Amino acid sequence: MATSSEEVLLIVKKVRQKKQDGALYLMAERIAWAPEGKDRFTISHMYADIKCQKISPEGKAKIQLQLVLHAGDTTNFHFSNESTAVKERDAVKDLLQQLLPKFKRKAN
């Protein structure tokens, strides 16, 4: 329970970064993403370093979530999961923004 453990709170499927196939896994204090069907993670950010996140609303050909890090970084996550794309988008949004100020390491 938020004890530096790899406890995946939210398992998001078919997530693409810049159209790259993958899966988004929300752990206790870190959010990681790895290509779908691959065992090697490529994206790993701590909630501590993330300041906020923006979500690309309907009207686009792809529903997405961009992570705005207070370190000057941004991660565009396209929810290409036809099954729960929009649904996962908001669930991830909420969970992330809820944990965002809880692990805030910007107090430095």
Partner: protein, 48 residues
């Protein structure tokens, strides 16, 4: 209208960094619970 990113062929090979609507997100911010006292269970100790 057209997508404000891909003006011509640049990375339509791997389809990575060429086009994306990254200038249209409902910007979500760090949301915290309105609390003015972290003692709701500790106070229910009843007795020692």
């Amino acid at each position: 209208a057209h997508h404000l990113k891909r003006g011509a062929t640049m990375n339509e090979d791997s389809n990575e960094e060429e086009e994306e609507s990254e200038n249209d997100w409902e910007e979500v911010e760090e949301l915290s619970e309105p609390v003015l006292g972290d003692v709701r269970e500790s106070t229910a100790f009843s007795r020692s």
